[PDB]
Amino acid sequence: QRAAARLEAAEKLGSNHEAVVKEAGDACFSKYGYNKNPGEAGENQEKINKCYRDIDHYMRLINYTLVVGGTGPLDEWGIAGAREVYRTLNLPSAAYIAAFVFTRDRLCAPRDMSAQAGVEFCTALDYLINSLS
Ligand SMILES: *[C@@H](C)[C@H]1/C(=C/c2[nH]c(/C=C3N=C(/C=C4\NC(=O)C(CC)=C4C)C(C)=C\3CCC(=O)O)c(CCC(=O)O)c2C)NC(=O)[C@@H]1C
Ligand SMILES: *[C@@H](C)[C@H]1/C(=C/c2[nH]c(/C=C3N=C(/C=C4\NC(=O)C(CC)=C4C)C(C)=C\3CCC(=O)O)c(CCC(=O)O)c2C)NC(=O)[C@@H]1C
């Protein structure tokens, strides 16, 4: 009666995330090509190599969100305490939000998923964009 909407999306993301996560990655370091700089967020392939894990992680908990229904998994396992431990590491908040809008911008209904499926695929990416600010 409702599930199908969220369901389809999660599966869609499920079978194709490494291509959407990586996609976001490159774009993330496009708006902030200064992170590459020496002594910066992804200066070296080990701090830029793992930063990609953080993208699969946020999208990881989204498959789980649109399956249990709400933003339950995403929450505790990535909504608060993750953000001001970045403050501890000096991992900018605007950098994390750079992957999201791109992810949310790229969608398409006839080509990538569906009409109703998408507006909720963008509901948990925006639910995260808002949480990071
Ligand atoms: C409508 C938004 C605009 C449009 C889109 C467009 N998308 C691609 C290619 C990709 N975009 C995606 C996005 C996803 N794939 C998924 O399965 C999911 C589910 C989580 C999403 C939202 C990805 C990863 C790609 C690369 C792989 C692929 O071809 O599927 C293109 C191809 C050209 C390009 O990369 O720019 C296009 C045409 N076209 C417009 O210009 C629209 C306004
Ligand atoms: C691009 C987006 C940014 C980037 C990221 C970056 N990540 C870290 C360190 C951590 N990021 C996470 C994220 C999670 N860990 C979790 O446990 C969860 C929730 C279950 C998630 C989603 C965490 C917690 C850490 C820290 C501790 C650890 O080593 O595991 C780093 C490295 C840190 C350092 O002090 O060297 C990086 C590089 N880097 C960028 O360029 C961006 C701004």
Q: Is 47 in contact with 41 (CB distance < 8 Å)?
A: yes
Distance 89 CA to ligand 1 centre (A): 33
Ligand 1 surroundings by CB, under 6 angstroms: 12-13, 16, 19-20, 23, 106-108, 112-113
Cα–Cα distance list, 43 to 13, 29, 55, 96, 124 (Å): 29, 11, 17, 16, 29
Residue whose entry in the numeric block shows the structure tokens 């963008």: 122
What are the counts of helices (DSSP H) followed by strands (DSSP E) for the chain?
7, 0
Non-local CB neighbours of 51 within 8 Å, separated by 6+ positions: 25, 41, 42
d(CA 63, CA 6): 9
If you take atom 20 of ligand 2, which residue's CA is the nearest one? 77
Distance 103 CA to ligand 1 centre (A): 10
If you take atom 1 of ligand 1, which residue's CA is the nearest one? 108
Tell whether the torsion through CA atoms of 46, 51, 52 and 57 is positive or negative.
Answer: positive
Which candidate, 122, 10, 112, 125, places its Cα nearest to that of 67? 10
User: Distance of alpha carbon 33 from its chain centroid, rounded?
Assistant: 19
If you take atom 26 of ligand 1, which residue's CA is the nearest one? 19
d(CA 62, CA 21): 12
Burial 89-119 (b: 16+ CB within 10 A, else e): eebeeebbbbbbbbbbeebeeeebbbeebbe
Final resolution, Å: 2.6
Distance 18 CA to ligand 2 centre (A): 17
What technique solved it? Answer: X-ray
If you take atom 19 of ligand 1, which residue's CA is the nearest one? 13
Domains of the chain plus CATH, in order, are: 1-133 (1.10.490.20)
Q: Is 42 in contact with 29 (CB distance < 8 Å)?
A: yes
